[PDB]
Amino acid sequence: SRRWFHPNITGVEAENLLLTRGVDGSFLARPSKSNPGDFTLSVRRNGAVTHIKIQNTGDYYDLYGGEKFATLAELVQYYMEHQLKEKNGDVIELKYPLNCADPTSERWFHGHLSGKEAEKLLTEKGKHGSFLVRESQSHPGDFVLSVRTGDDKDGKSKVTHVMIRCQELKYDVGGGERFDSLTDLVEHYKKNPMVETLGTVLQLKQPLNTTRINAAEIESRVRELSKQGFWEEFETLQQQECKLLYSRKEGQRQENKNKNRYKNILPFDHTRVVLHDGDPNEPVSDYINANIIMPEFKKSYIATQGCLQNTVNDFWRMVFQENSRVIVMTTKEVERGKSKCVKYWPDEYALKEYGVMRVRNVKESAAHDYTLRELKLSKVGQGNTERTVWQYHFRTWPDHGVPSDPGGVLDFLEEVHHKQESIMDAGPVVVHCSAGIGRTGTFIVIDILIDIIREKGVDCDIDVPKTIQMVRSQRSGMVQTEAQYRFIYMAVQHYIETLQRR
Numbered sequence: 140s141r142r143w144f145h146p147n148i149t150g151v152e153a154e155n156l157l158l159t160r161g162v163d164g165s166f167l168a169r170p171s172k173s174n175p176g177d178f179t180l181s182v183r184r185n186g187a188v189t190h191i192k193i194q195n196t197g198d199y200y201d202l203y204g205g206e207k208f209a210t211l212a213e214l215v216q217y218y219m220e221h222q223l224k225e226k227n228g229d230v231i232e233l234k235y236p237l238n239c240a241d242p243t244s245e246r247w248f249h250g251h252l253s254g255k256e257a258e259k260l261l262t263e264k265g266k267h268g269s270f271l272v273r274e275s276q277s278h279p280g281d282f283v284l285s286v287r288t289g290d291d292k293d294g295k296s297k298v299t300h301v302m303i304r305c306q307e308l309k310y311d312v313g314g315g316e317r318f319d320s321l322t323d324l325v326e327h328y329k330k331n332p333m334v335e336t337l338g339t340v341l342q343l344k345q346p347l348n349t350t351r352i353n354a355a356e357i358e359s360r361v362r363e364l365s366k367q368g369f370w371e372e373f374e375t376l377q378q379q380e381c382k383l384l385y386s387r388k389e390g391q392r393q394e395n396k397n398k399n400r401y402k403n404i405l406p407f408d409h410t411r412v413v414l415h416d417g418d419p420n421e422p423v424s425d426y427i428n429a430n431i432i433m434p435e436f437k438k439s440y441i442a443t444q445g446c447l448q449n450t451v452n453d454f455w456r457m458v459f460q461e462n463s464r465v466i467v468m469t470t471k472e473v474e475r476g477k478s479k480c481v482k483y484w485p486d487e488y489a490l491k492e493y494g495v496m497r498v499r500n501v502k503e504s505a506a507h508d509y510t511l512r513e514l515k516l517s518k519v520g521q522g523n524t525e526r527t528v529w530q531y532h533f534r535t536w537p538d539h540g541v542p543s544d545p546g547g548v549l550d551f552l553e554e555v556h557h558k559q560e561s562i563m564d565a566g567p568v569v570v571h572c573s574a575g576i577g578r579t580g581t582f583i584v585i586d587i588l589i590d591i592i593r594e595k596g597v598d599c600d601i602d603v604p605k606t607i608q609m610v611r612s613q614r615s616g617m618v619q620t621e622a623q624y625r626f627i628y629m630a631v632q633h634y635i636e637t638l639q640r641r
């Protein structure tokens with residue numbers, strides 16, 4: 140599904156792969172592994188190889204001479220069904236993904252790991268059908284598939300080790316088919332499980348979970364990941380984004396095209412915020428580029444983009460309808476001279492109408508990292524509909540990368556949390572600006588994780604990539620970069636430490 144991404148290939152290796160194993164229309168994507176959030180799309184055309192840069196500074200994937208995308212999988216899906224051009228404007232066709240054989244980004248691949256370590260991990264964390272593949276230590280170059288089976292409710296469970304031989308670049312389990320990569324082998328024995336002579340089915344149901352940690356042991360995990368293990372954990376997460384190609388048909392409708400900041404960054408249909416009670420004289424009045432984010436799908440969120448001038452009225456309709464009482468903005472109005480979050484609220488002490496909605500800005504309060512605006516929102520003609528909406532505008536996030544210290548983000552989220560908790564029956568917290576996926580995804584995930592710790596204490600389990608994958612199933616590409624990924628771990632660590640300091 141995403142075998143076209145090669146995490147460990149060089150540019151020359153990419154050319155040699157396309158020229159020797161590809162044809163015209165063959166393509167792959169790869170990182171620039173030194174430089175953060177640089178990728179290359181390498182494409183064979185007329186017997187030569189073109190390299191197209193994709194940049195991600197934290198907000199979206201920006202394909203040079205193309206469009207902006209929420210994930211590389213959504214990028215590849217878009218051009219494999221459509222549009223891509225060179226500097227000189229010639230069409231570059233993405234026809235044939237050139238598949239990677241490298242197992243390092245697979246959830247089940249542990250690399251160097253002994254049989255006793257694999258048994259201990261499968262014993263402590265595994266259940267029936269949990270498996271992993273590890274390098275062989277007795278027969279170098281070969282591999283071992285280790286699988287737990289049993290009763291998950293004293294000998295009722297066991298671990299089986301199946302030897303995987305590598306013989307001339309192909310892989311086998313001692314007989315039958317010979318596979319071009321470990322992934323093909325694992326996929327085959329996932330669909331067609333091995334059976335032991337005496338009948339046990341070696342069911343490959345789920346990879347062994349290695350990312351769930353006790354929150355108390357965050358500092359140790361961050362230490363191991365900083366030896367660089369954050370990269371591999373992040374790329375293993377990125378590999379699974381091909382499971383999240385959910386439909387975005389509503390956002391693609393002609394009537395909704397100009398309601399999106401970027402034409403291809405769109406809300407999933409199954410989680411989009413549907414706007415009711417619109418003008419009956421607008422044919423399509425139900426659409427905003429926003430998704431409900433419900434953790435492990437009390438506190439929920441709406442993740443959305445910065446307004447366009449023609450969606451400000453819809454944004455207020457959304458806040459009103461959903462009963463939201465707290466807004467987080469993740470960008471300044473302008474960064475690098477470019478509009479990142481258009482002003483949609485009145486000046487301090489002023490009152491404005493935004494279609495059927497009326498907003499008063501009661502008071503602004505400046506703090507070091509943010510500005511708070513106390514807004515009163517009501518429906519025109521209906522005085523008794525008024526409610527206070529507290530807008531927390533984060534203003535110190537750097538123009539590129541992530542904050543060097545998570546303290547400001549954490550203090551801000553602590554205040555936002557208490558505000559939300561103080562208001563009976565407050566609806567979801569709105570988090571937005573830019574495309575509403577990078578910084579927005581980062582703030583939401585931190586907030587989710589820190590809320591578990593706040594209620595359960597240091598002695599509770601957290602799983603950073605599993606949480607992110609759960610949020611990415613509700614809006615495309617929530618958490619854009621490895622720098623934001625590492626920043627989430629750092630924020631959880633700093634939160635745990637400040638709570639041990641008190």
Ligand SMILES: N[C@@H]1C[C@H]2CC[C@@H](C1)N2c1cnc2c(-c3cccc(Cl)c3Cl)c[nH]c2c1
Pocket residue numbers: 242243244245246247248249348349350371372373375376377379604605608
């Ligand atoms: N290649 C390896 C990278 C390290 C080291 C061993 C193992 C595999 N390990 C790992 C395992 N699992 C994940 C996940 C993940 C966890 C829950 C749900 C989903 Cl969908 C995902 Cl992708 C993200 N990163 C991981 C890294």
